[PDB]
Amino acid sequence: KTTVPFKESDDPSIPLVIIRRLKTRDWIVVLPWFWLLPLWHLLNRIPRMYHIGLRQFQQIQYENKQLYFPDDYPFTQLGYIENS
Amino acid sequence: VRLKSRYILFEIIFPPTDTNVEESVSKADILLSHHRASPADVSIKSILQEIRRSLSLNLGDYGSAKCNSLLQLKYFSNKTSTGIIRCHREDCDLVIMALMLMSKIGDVDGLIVNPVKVSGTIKKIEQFAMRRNSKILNIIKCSQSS
RNA sequence: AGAAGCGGAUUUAGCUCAGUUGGGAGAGCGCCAGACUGAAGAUCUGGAGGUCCUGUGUUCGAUCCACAGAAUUCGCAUUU
RNA sequence: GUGGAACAGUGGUAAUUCCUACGAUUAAGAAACCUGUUUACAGAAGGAUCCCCACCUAUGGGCGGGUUAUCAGAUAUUAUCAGGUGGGAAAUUCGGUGGAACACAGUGGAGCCUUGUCCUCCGGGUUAAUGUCGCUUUUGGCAUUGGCCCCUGCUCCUGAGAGAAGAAAUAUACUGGGGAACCAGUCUUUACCGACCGUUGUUAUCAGAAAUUCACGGAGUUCGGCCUAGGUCGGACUCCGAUGGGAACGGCAACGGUUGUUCCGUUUGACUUGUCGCCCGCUACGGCGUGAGCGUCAAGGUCUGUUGAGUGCAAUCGUAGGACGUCAUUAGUGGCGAACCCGAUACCGAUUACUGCUGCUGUUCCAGC
Ligand SMILES: [Mg+2]
Ligand SMILES: [Mg+2]
């Protein structure tokens, strides 16, 4: 067996929240700051999981007919200022 | 560093010149009647000696000098009558026009040459030839099943 | 005329190759000459023959040490 | 000192000039080549209106049976097509990353010892205590002990990259060269005090006293003994001695005390095949048949599982027209858009080959007075 058992007295039970985000069609999971990396390191050790860049996130928002704030929002103040 | 030489696939097709013999009108039947067989005295050196003589008598000497720099027959088998000629990318026009004017072999006459596939690599030409022969087997199997 | 990318080895007389506390620039073969034979080979003696891959810099002095620029060539379960 | 012309060095940046169209298939991936038009739906799932026959009620209507007409956003089209194809360097391989989770030396195990010392920078300054020696509220000098103070230049995981040397100089620490911005090596970075680590071997022959602080000769100072017109002896320090590149703890090569050293193993895969175990049915000593089920193990069976290029006997095309730039003309057009070079997993730094632009520096020539 390859595991470490749980103890109610001396093991750090964390809160974990996984929610669906509707228009961007993606599942976001929220967690405390120093807890994220023990969750994050075990993710892509599954051999069918890769990481995303911000240009890749812009490509994902472009593919699903969605919108993006630094680029595809020219109407707003900060978007117009930064983009232009 | 490498060399950008193009390969040309050609196939020997025999037109069924039979004026007194009747003919059957179908697709795979005329594929059988054109893709019959190669004759006995057909090899690599015979096709090379014939195509160099056609290059001499048709295109000349200095054109034959430009063509015969990398004029080699890399792969050929008489069971299927398909061959691959290596050439340059500049004189590929000259090699295909020499393949067009092939009239007869010195032993067997009454034949045409079909240049089918040209590419700068031989591995994709082999992949195209397997797919083309697979389509030929599809046509043969469709006419054989019905 | 079978690339691309990776590691190892390596360049010294015409050739094949040594060699180096860092202080002399070499051996075998080849060429020429001497010796020898009636003549020739072999053996033996002597001479001619240098871009130590090139360059920088270190040092008092570079085949050697450091750096830079070239490359030579093997291997990738191969004899194409 | 200025302006022009030419050359040279370094730093930064760019490279198919761009657009348009075309390049055989019912055998539907043949211009050279690749990818894509795959999260299946017409609120047609008991759909809507309508025809005929029979039934019940009447001011509307509903049910049953039969064939079947119309309709599903631009009354249409089921069978077409789109986009891209070399770079600063892809050459060079010097490097490292995708294995490490912020030093948690990425983790574990074994062996050895000096057995992993919460240790100490040396060194400089202040403060307190003690003891000695000279002035006499008291101060000064020396030695010990205890306490404090003494400087991550920037980004980055790594490799590396570039900035400035007013705390002592004119050349901006030292040394050598460059024609100057500067280059190379040893270094330091708000050091409000500086700090070139130790060991081993080498500098061949000669020279010189000596080739590594061996020793020797001379002069000066201080101390001790014999001794007292101050003569001699010993020890310590400083300076000098013809030679050679040379006496300078200077130059070269190798090794480490840093938080103990060393060894061993992976944390790296996806499909295919084979075995084993788990639930269902038959049978009951281990058995057999299916789940397009799961976990472990093995296999030179495969890796276009491939990347707004992805080849692997190594594709990155041909042509026409238009727009722009440069150069030469006899009527107005012609030529050229290159040089170097070219993937093979991707990333970034540095170096090398060439063109053009830009800033600085140096040299030469020519004048305004
Ligand atoms: Mg390459
Ligand atoms: Mg390379």
XYZ file of C-alpha atoms (C1' of nucleotides) and ligand atoms in Angstrom:
681
model
C 0.000 0.000 0.000
C 1.123 3.561 -0.802
C -0.692 5.916 1.593
C -0.462 7.764 4.922
C -3.474 7.321 7.222
C -5.600 10.097 8.678
C -5.705 10.895 12.396
C -8.354 13.187 13.885
C -5.916 14.419 16.558
C -2.658 15.139 14.722
C -3.351 15.643 10.998
C -4.077 19.004 9.329
C -7.641 18.770 7.994
C -7.959 21.602 5.462
C -11.076 23.285 4.064
C -11.453 22.728 0.325
C -13.870 24.461 -2.059
C -14.437 23.518 -5.717
C -16.957 25.632 -7.652
C -18.092 25.915 -11.274
C -17.635 29.173 -13.193
C -20.368 29.504 -15.773
C -19.493 31.654 -18.795
C -15.776 30.822 -18.854
C -16.760 27.093 -18.722
C -14.066 26.191 -16.156
C -13.847 24.738 -12.633
C -12.066 26.965 -10.100
C -10.866 25.588 -6.754
C -9.972 27.985 -3.939
C -7.680 27.308 -0.965
C -5.382 29.158 1.466
C -2.045 30.550 0.241
C 0.438 28.138 1.846
C -1.880 25.171 1.226
C -2.039 25.709 -2.544
C 1.392 24.271 -3.443
C 0.862 20.821 -1.773
C -2.338 20.638 -3.813
C -0.722 22.134 -6.963
C 2.388 19.919 -7.082
C 0.344 16.706 -7.136
C -1.912 17.956 -9.956
C 0.164 17.546 -13.111
C 1.964 14.420 -11.861
C -1.180 12.872 -13.271
C 0.234 12.235 -16.776
C -2.605 14.027 -18.640
C -2.461 17.485 -17.059
C -0.575 20.530 -18.345
C -0.263 24.167 -17.274
C -1.760 27.336 -18.783
C -0.174 30.670 -19.647
C -1.923 34.030 -19.764
C -1.729 34.058 -23.562
C -3.145 30.530 -23.409
C -5.921 31.771 -21.111
C -6.604 34.498 -23.683
C -6.780 31.743 -26.320
C -9.268 29.806 -24.155
C -11.403 32.941 -23.732
C -11.135 33.517 -27.495
C -12.220 29.963 -28.343
C -15.373 29.892 -26.186
C -16.637 33.202 -27.728
C -15.894 34.896 -24.385
C -14.179 38.153 -23.434
C -10.966 39.235 -21.724
C -10.278 42.362 -19.706
C -6.770 43.692 -20.740
C -7.439 43.039 -24.445
C -11.106 42.483 -25.330
C -12.464 45.232 -23.044
C -11.802 48.580 -24.775
C -14.933 50.319 -23.466
C -13.844 50.507 -19.820
C -11.421 53.125 -18.469
C -8.453 50.957 -17.438
C -8.823 48.654 -20.442
C -8.794 51.588 -22.886
C -5.835 53.253 -21.109
C -3.680 50.103 -20.844
C -4.523 48.666 -24.289
C -4.243 51.953 -26.215
C 23.412 21.021 -43.690
C 21.577 18.855 -46.239
C 20.628 18.608 -49.908
C 17.176 19.459 -51.283
C 16.677 16.813 -53.960
C 13.209 15.891 -55.227
C 11.959 12.368 -55.946
C 9.537 11.457 -58.752
C 7.236 8.422 -58.752
C 6.468 6.911 -62.167
C 4.423 3.906 -63.277
C 4.570 1.893 -66.505
C 1.099 1.511 -68.041
C 0.456 -0.694 -71.083
C -2.399 0.508 -73.334
C -4.437 -2.481 -74.548
C -4.012 -1.993 -78.314
C -6.292 -4.811 -79.520
C -8.283 -3.834 -82.613
C -9.904 -7.226 -83.280
C -10.534 -8.095 -79.609
C -13.586 -6.628 -77.839
C -13.398 -4.651 -74.605
C -15.291 -4.556 -71.300
C -16.397 -1.174 -69.978
C -15.817 -0.822 -66.222
C -13.503 0.925 -63.783
C -11.608 -1.870 -62.021
C -11.741 -4.013 -65.165
C -9.828 -1.374 -67.116
C -7.518 -0.988 -64.106
C -6.866 -4.726 -64.518
C -6.395 -4.264 -68.259
C -3.866 -1.424 -67.848
C -2.069 -2.631 -64.709
C -1.406 -6.097 -66.220
C 2.307 -6.907 -65.768
C 5.835 -5.850 -66.560
C 7.745 -7.952 -69.125
C 10.704 -10.213 -68.426
C 13.755 -8.068 -69.249
C 12.993 -5.068 -67.014
C 15.444 -4.036 -64.299
C 16.959 -0.921 -62.755
C 19.901 -0.752 -65.178
C 17.688 -1.342 -68.230
C 15.337 1.530 -67.342
C 18.353 3.742 -66.577
C 20.033 2.871 -69.897
C 16.780 3.557 -71.760
C 16.102 6.876 -70.016
C 19.681 8.061 -70.595
C 19.312 7.275 -74.307
C 15.980 9.128 -74.371
C 17.668 12.013 -72.522
C 20.439 12.040 -75.143
C 18.267 11.803 -78.266
C 15.488 14.077 -76.968
C 17.069 16.723 -74.743
C 20.641 16.679 -76.011
C 23.999 16.748 -74.263
C 24.285 19.810 -72.002
C 20.693 19.347 -70.896
C 21.660 15.715 -70.324
C 24.688 17.059 -68.447
C 22.419 19.083 -66.156
C 19.972 16.185 -65.746
C 22.601 13.459 -65.206
C 24.156 15.161 -62.167
C 21.850 13.297 -59.748
C 19.947 11.044 -62.181
C 19.507 7.816 -60.216
C 16.758 5.219 -59.811
C 16.513 4.705 -56.057
C 13.727 2.122 -55.818
C 12.085 -0.050 -58.463
C 10.483 -3.496 -58.525
C 9.198 -5.236 -61.647
C 6.272 -6.897 -59.846
C 4.348 -3.611 -59.534
C 6.152 -1.476 -62.204
C 6.474 1.601 -59.966
C 9.762 3.462 -59.690
C 11.301 6.443 -57.891
C 13.785 8.695 -59.699
C 15.945 11.116 -57.727
C 16.583 14.534 -59.281
C 17.247 18.174 -58.504
C 14.480 20.653 -57.741
C 15.553 22.846 -60.668
C 15.772 20.110 -63.316
C 12.598 18.351 -62.104
C 10.813 19.962 -65.072
C 13.422 18.424 -67.389
C 13.154 14.987 -65.740
C 9.333 14.941 -65.970
C 9.432 16.061 -69.613
C 11.958 13.285 -70.284
C 9.591 10.822 -68.576
C 6.773 12.058 -70.818
C 8.604 11.437 -74.113
C 9.452 7.814 -73.245
C 8.201 5.984 -76.339
C 9.371 2.369 -76.099
C 11.911 0.072 -74.506
C 14.392 -1.640 -76.835
C 12.810 -5.036 -76.140
C 9.084 -4.282 -75.647
C 7.129 -1.513 -77.396
C 3.582 -0.273 -76.888
C 3.702 1.400 -73.469
C 3.228 4.775 -71.774
C 4.815 6.196 -68.628
C 2.700 7.949 -65.987
C 4.521 10.356 -63.647
C 2.260 10.418 -60.601
C 3.882 11.904 -57.500
C 6.652 14.467 -57.041
C 7.953 15.521 -53.633
C 11.229 16.551 -52.046
C 11.118 13.560 -49.681
C 10.794 9.853 -50.449
C 9.040 8.869 -47.201
C 5.883 10.848 -47.993
C 5.942 9.504 -51.568
C 5.956 5.970 -50.144
C 3.077 6.961 -47.840
C 1.169 8.343 -50.832
C 1.921 5.204 -52.861
C 0.586 2.932 -50.110
C -2.598 5.033 -49.947
C -2.982 5.059 -53.746
C -2.504 1.285 -53.910
C -5.011 1.000 -51.052
C -7.517 2.955 -53.152
C -6.761 0.610 -56.072
C -7.486 -2.359 -53.771
C -10.717 -0.599 -52.747
C -11.829 -0.273 -56.391
C -10.819 -3.901 -57.105
C -12.668 -5.139 -54.003
C -15.794 -3.134 -54.875
C -15.923 -4.589 -58.386
C -15.038 -8.067 -57.102
C -17.743 -8.133 -54.421
C -20.287 -6.848 -56.955
C 25.461 13.010 -51.539
C 22.422 9.435 -46.688
C 21.163 15.759 -42.451
C 19.672 17.160 -37.448
C 20.793 17.173 -32.271
C 24.618 14.291 -27.737
C 28.707 12.694 -25.431
C 34.295 10.826 -26.058
C 38.835 11.116 -28.530
C 42.245 14.296 -31.390
C 45.650 17.796 -34.952
C 53.657 17.662 -34.256
C 58.872 16.542 -40.860
C 56.067 14.342 -47.408
C 53.758 10.083 -44.590
C 52.390 7.046 -39.969
C 53.046 8.553 -35.072
C 55.953 9.468 -30.328
C 57.137 12.871 -26.855
C 56.632 17.127 -22.832
C 59.477 19.972 -14.041
C 57.841 24.248 -19.143
C 64.159 25.387 -21.085
C 67.055 19.718 -27.020
C 62.335 20.116 -31.181
C 62.371 13.672 -32.474
C 61.865 8.038 -34.091
C 60.307 4.483 -38.132
C 59.318 4.765 -43.368
C 60.394 7.659 -47.669
C 64.204 10.868 -50.587
C 69.572 11.760 -51.390
C 74.538 10.244 -50.262
C 78.219 6.924 -48.117
C 79.344 1.850 -47.155
C 78.637 -2.951 -49.572
C 77.914 -6.242 -54.331
C 80.008 -8.465 -60.843
C 74.834 -5.956 -60.337
C 70.621 -5.562 -56.990
C 67.777 -6.323 -52.495
C 68.496 -6.670 -47.265
C 71.620 -4.847 -43.228
C 74.492 -0.493 -41.570
C 76.268 5.037 -41.407
C 75.381 10.217 -42.421
C 72.835 14.471 -44.389
C 68.663 17.175 -46.342
C 63.628 17.842 -44.735
C 59.170 21.966 -39.329
C 53.111 27.104 -40.003
C 54.405 21.680 -33.338
C 46.177 23.889 -36.524
C 45.809 29.426 -35.950
C 45.439 33.647 -32.558
C 45.474 36.123 -27.740
C 47.439 36.326 -22.897
C 50.211 34.429 -18.567
C 55.809 33.642 -17.752
C 62.074 35.353 -17.937
C 61.039 31.318 -21.973
C 55.818 27.821 -24.888
C 54.412 21.529 -28.889
C 53.031 21.712 -22.971
C 49.264 26.164 -19.318
C 44.561 29.566 -19.729
C 41.025 31.687 -23.253
C 39.046 32.500 -28.251
C 38.400 30.925 -33.462
C 38.615 26.625 -36.917
C 38.321 21.601 -37.281
C 39.866 16.111 -37.310
C 37.172 11.671 -36.157
C 34.422 7.707 -33.642
C 29.935 5.949 -31.448
C 24.154 6.337 -31.526
C 22.394 -2.463 -30.860
C 26.025 -0.318 -38.009
C 29.278 -2.838 -42.932
C 25.322 1.830 -46.212
C 37.249 74.841 -30.601
C 33.984 74.158 -35.007
C 31.689 71.949 -40.044
C 32.314 68.417 -44.129
C 34.615 63.764 -46.370
C 37.026 58.864 -45.550
C 38.495 54.739 -42.338
C 38.579 51.925 -37.773
C 36.527 49.936 -32.704
C 32.301 48.958 -29.487
C 26.963 49.096 -27.762
C 21.517 48.556 -29.375
C 18.101 46.748 -33.097
C 15.904 44.399 -38.074
C 15.980 40.604 -41.920
C 11.311 35.103 -46.941
C 9.366 43.617 -48.603
C 3.915 43.346 -48.218
C -0.901 42.118 -50.334
C -4.066 39.477 -54.036
C -5.438 35.077 -57.166
C -4.275 30.073 -59.292
C -1.766 25.264 -59.260
C -5.808 17.412 -61.368
C -9.537 13.211 -57.717
C -17.097 9.752 -55.798
C -10.034 6.988 -56.590
C -13.333 12.903 -51.972
C -5.393 13.968 -47.757
C -1.387 14.017 -55.888
C 0.491 22.581 -56.326
C 6.280 20.246 -51.970
C 3.995 19.849 -46.667
C 0.856 20.332 -42.039
C -3.636 21.460 -39.137
C -8.864 22.412 -38.791
C -14.150 22.716 -40.358
C -15.907 16.295 -33.540
C -18.471 18.628 -26.632
C -24.334 15.006 -31.964
C -30.210 18.402 -31.460
C -34.993 22.366 -36.515
C -38.363 23.817 -27.939
C -40.859 18.147 -35.242
C -40.589 13.426 -28.082
C -46.724 10.902 -27.960
C -45.227 18.083 -33.223
C -49.308 21.812 -35.260
C -53.295 22.638 -39.090
C -56.174 19.700 -42.531
C -59.391 14.823 -45.628
C -63.208 10.888 -45.247
C -66.520 7.637 -42.289
C -69.316 6.429 -37.582
C -70.851 8.033 -32.540
C -72.985 11.797 -28.483
C -74.688 16.762 -27.620
C -76.007 21.431 -29.757
C -74.719 28.337 -29.056
C -69.150 26.151 -29.316
C -66.950 20.536 -29.663
C -64.567 15.720 -28.461
C -63.187 10.563 -29.313
C -62.006 5.998 -32.691
C -60.290 3.970 -37.657
C -57.743 4.737 -42.715
C -54.519 6.769 -46.324
C -51.713 11.175 -46.448
C -51.128 17.210 -48.240
C -48.495 21.868 -46.076
C -44.683 23.795 -42.322
C -39.303 23.563 -39.245
C -34.756 31.600 -38.801
C -31.833 34.711 -45.554
C -39.396 30.080 -49.603
C -32.317 27.789 -51.342
C -27.844 24.690 -51.276
C -26.734 17.616 -48.009
C -20.949 16.140 -51.670
C -17.424 22.384 -50.307
C -13.369 24.783 -48.043
C -9.885 27.968 -44.865
C -5.120 29.311 -42.609
C 0.216 28.730 -42.261
C 5.074 27.094 -44.042
C 12.753 29.294 -42.179
C 16.217 32.591 -38.100
C 18.968 36.106 -35.668
C 21.350 33.670 -36.057
C 18.321 27.984 -36.846
C 25.702 27.665 -37.624
C 28.796 27.561 -32.873
C 27.847 23.887 -27.646
C 30.002 26.847 -23.519
C 26.024 26.401 -20.132
C 21.418 25.091 -17.253
C 15.859 24.186 -16.900
C 11.253 21.051 -17.768
C 13.841 15.665 -11.173
C 13.401 18.767 -6.257
C 7.984 21.258 -2.981
C 11.549 29.224 -1.372
C 17.898 25.836 2.483
C 12.961 21.471 3.823
C 21.515 20.482 1.248
C 14.659 17.183 -2.928
C 14.040 12.668 -0.012
C 15.495 7.685 2.147
C 19.082 3.767 3.609
C 23.933 1.852 4.883
C 29.184 2.398 6.522
C 33.182 5.376 8.860
C 35.050 9.167 12.251
C 37.424 14.162 14.586
C 30.732 10.937 16.589
C 27.618 16.651 13.201
C 30.598 21.606 19.286
C 22.913 26.097 19.209
C 31.027 27.289 18.132
C 35.173 31.727 16.680
C 35.867 35.534 11.862
C 40.908 37.404 12.898
C 40.603 42.152 13.545
C 38.827 47.805 15.125
C 35.733 51.226 18.552
C 32.861 52.203 23.067
C 31.376 50.834 28.268
C 32.126 48.056 33.199
C 35.498 45.253 36.766
C 40.567 43.815 38.439
C 46.302 44.328 39.091
C 50.799 47.142 38.241
C 53.542 52.060 37.084
C 53.959 57.879 37.154
C 50.613 62.815 38.746
C 47.702 63.230 43.537
C 39.279 65.910 43.504
C 41.605 62.787 39.906
C 43.753 61.595 35.183
C 47.133 58.831 31.735
C 49.523 53.964 29.672
C 49.558 48.409 29.778
C 47.266 43.103 30.238
C 42.917 40.012 31.254
C 37.415 39.071 31.453
C 32.170 40.095 30.001
C 28.441 42.887 26.823
C 27.344 45.680 22.234
C 28.402 47.699 17.194
C 30.994 46.283 11.674
C 28.404 46.578 4.774
C 23.021 39.844 0.436
C 24.842 46.461 -5.589
C 20.240 44.654 -9.297
C 16.932 40.532 -12.021
C 16.694 35.309 -11.863
C 15.294 28.199 -9.663
C 19.731 27.373 -12.484
C 23.306 28.882 -16.061
C 24.407 33.935 -16.538
C 23.843 39.169 -17.707
C 25.084 44.104 -17.342
C 25.770 49.030 -13.260
C 29.464 52.390 -10.327
C 34.574 52.590 -8.110
C 33.863 61.375 -5.280
C 34.933 56.817 2.585
C 43.568 58.772 -0.002
C 45.019 61.483 -6.442
C 45.655 64.086 -11.816
C 45.119 57.980 -15.298
C 39.207 57.354 -10.970
C 41.584 50.029 -6.118
C 46.050 47.111 -8.115
C 48.863 45.164 -12.752
C 49.698 44.911 -18.168
C 48.470 46.646 -22.915
C 44.795 49.995 -26.400
C 44.433 55.265 -30.500
C 40.154 56.182 -26.875
C 35.468 54.996 -25.333
C 38.091 50.873 -22.858
C 39.794 45.087 -22.575
C 41.911 41.154 -19.642
C 43.185 39.111 -14.482
C 43.162 39.827 -9.021
C 39.148 42.601 -6.029
C 35.553 45.607 -3.279
C 30.704 47.597 -3.285
C 25.798 52.686 2.087
C 32.594 48.722 4.142
C 30.737 56.564 7.628
C 38.285 51.018 10.401
C 41.088 47.869 6.934
C 42.051 42.860 5.530
C 44.996 39.279 -1.809
C 43.545 32.271 3.165
C 46.980 28.062 4.421
C 50.033 23.942 2.772
C 53.183 21.489 -1.013
C 56.436 21.774 -5.291
C 58.658 24.674 -9.157
C 61.697 29.637 -11.350
C 66.503 24.875 -15.511
C 72.834 26.324 -16.343
C 75.905 30.476 -14.827
C 76.320 34.507 -11.738
C 76.005 36.197 -6.751
C 76.856 35.354 -0.031
C 72.088 33.393 -1.041
C 66.187 30.939 -5.767
C 62.844 31.355 -1.147
C 61.307 35.071 4.900
C 68.373 28.397 6.046
C 72.831 30.934 6.664
C 76.961 34.452 5.979
C 79.576 40.186 5.891
C 79.162 45.723 7.487
C 76.718 49.875 10.164
C 73.113 51.809 14.024
C 70.027 50.976 18.514
C 68.549 48.365 23.127
C 69.538 44.507 27.123
C 72.742 41.032 30.055
C 77.946 38.970 31.819
C 83.556 40.116 32.517
C 84.754 45.003 33.161
C 84.859 50.804 33.607
C 88.438 56.392 29.645
C 82.376 52.964 27.104
C 87.482 47.295 25.114
C 85.373 42.439 24.054
C 81.139 38.461 23.932
C 75.855 36.755 23.263
C 70.583 37.651 21.938
C 66.655 40.915 19.285
C 65.328 44.673 15.528
C 66.288 47.945 11.170
C 69.103 49.193 6.658
C 72.678 47.836 2.583
C 75.822 44.536 -0.289
C 78.129 44.616 -8.164
C 74.844 38.938 -10.380
C 70.405 37.672 -13.042
C 63.394 39.149 -15.140
C 64.890 38.797 -9.606
C 65.576 38.849 -3.223
C 59.700 41.044 -3.909
C 56.373 35.957 2.354
C 56.553 38.102 -5.859
C 54.823 34.710 -10.276
C 52.900 29.553 -11.685
C 50.299 24.567 -10.665
C 47.325 21.305 -7.282
C 44.328 20.504 -2.844
C 40.367 22.230 1.306
C 37.975 24.592 6.958
C 32.548 26.551 4.770
C 26.000 23.675 7.568
C 31.064 16.211 8.436
C 32.926 12.848 3.847
C 31.522 8.980 0.446
C 28.128 5.410 -1.960
C 23.348 3.544 -3.809
C 17.752 4.290 -6.094
C 13.893 7.205 -8.538
C 10.549 11.784 -8.068
C 9.234 10.447 -15.935
C 5.187 8.880 -19.204
C 0.657 7.380 -22.813
C -1.512 3.593 -25.940
C -1.053 -2.344 -27.437
C -0.169 -7.359 -25.507
C 0.408 -11.176 -21.381
C -0.255 -12.704 -16.209
C -2.591 -12.053 -11.251
C -6.837 -10.264 -7.757
C -11.823 -8.054 -7.103
C -18.259 -8.241 -8.279
C -22.365 -11.689 -12.046
C -24.002 -16.883 -13.973
C -22.664 -22.380 -14.356
C -19.900 -25.804 -11.687
C -18.015 -26.533 -6.777
C -10.250 -28.759 -5.056
C -7.438 -24.763 -7.594
C -12.042 -23.875 -12.957
C -14.789 -21.579 -17.024
C -17.762 -17.066 -20.239
C -18.739 -11.215 -20.715
C -18.075 -6.278 -18.809
C -14.980 -2.360 -25.041
C -14.491 -1.850 -15.380
C -10.230 -1.046 -11.976
C -4.880 -1.819 -9.438
C 0.092 -3.883 -9.780
C 4.203 -6.093 -12.844
C 6.906 -7.048 -17.522
C 8.043 -6.574 -22.738
C 14.521 -2.923 -28.452
C 5.226 -3.912 -29.796
C 4.335 1.802 -31.073
C 5.177 7.434 -30.253
C 3.394 12.412 -36.793
C 1.041 11.729 -28.314
C 3.773 16.632 -33.401
C 4.989 22.349 -31.919
C -0.276 29.455 -34.419
C 6.504 24.784 -39.601
C 7.417 19.623 -37.499
C 10.831 16.630 -41.158
C 12.926 12.035 -40.222
C 17.470 9.023 -47.602
C 15.534 15.238 -43.849
C 8.867 19.387 -47.314
C 9.198 24.996 -46.257
C 7.221 25.714 -53.563
C 6.721 27.965 -59.099
C 4.435 32.133 -61.612
C 1.448 36.759 -62.627
C -0.478 41.627 -61.056
C -0.531 45.830 -57.629
C 1.829 49.028 -53.290
C 6.956 50.912 -51.189
C 12.480 51.733 -51.081
C 17.314 52.353 -53.508
C 20.502 53.107 -58.293
C 21.066 54.284 -63.535
C 18.427 56.922 -68.051
C 18.819 58.870 -75.065
C 11.086 59.983 -72.896
C 10.560 56.819 -69.068
C 11.616 52.816 -68.317
C 15.078 49.024 -66.650
C 17.633 46.219 -62.785
C 17.716 45.058 -57.505
C 14.738 43.834 -51.749
C 20.164 41.102 -50.279
C 24.790 39.022 -47.259
C 25.284 34.847 -43.394
C 22.860 31.216 -43.410
C 19.518 27.487 -42.852
C 15.167 23.509 -37.691
C 14.613 18.412 -35.965
C 11.918 19.037 -28.376
C 11.275 23.856 -26.457
C 13.562 27.944 -23.479
C 17.298 31.680 -22.369
C 22.522 33.763 -21.866
C 27.253 34.326 -24.358
C 30.412 33.881 -29.014
C 31.297 33.888 -34.381
C 29.818 35.316 -40.356
C 27.461 39.775 -43.371
C 24.178 44.274 -44.767
C 21.671 48.921 -43.186
C 20.404 52.524 -39.316
C 21.718 55.054 -34.650
C 25.132 57.258 -30.455
C 30.262 57.724 -28.732
C 35.570 57.731 -29.470
C 40.391 58.024 -32.351
C 43.168 59.334 -36.851
C 43.955 61.961 -41.602
C 42.681 65.963 -45.104
C 40.275 70.775 -46.252
C 38.704 76.466 -44.244
C 36.331 81.409 -40.429
C 39.409 84.932 -38.157
Mg 21.223 22.651 -36.877
Mg 23.200 22.864 -33.461
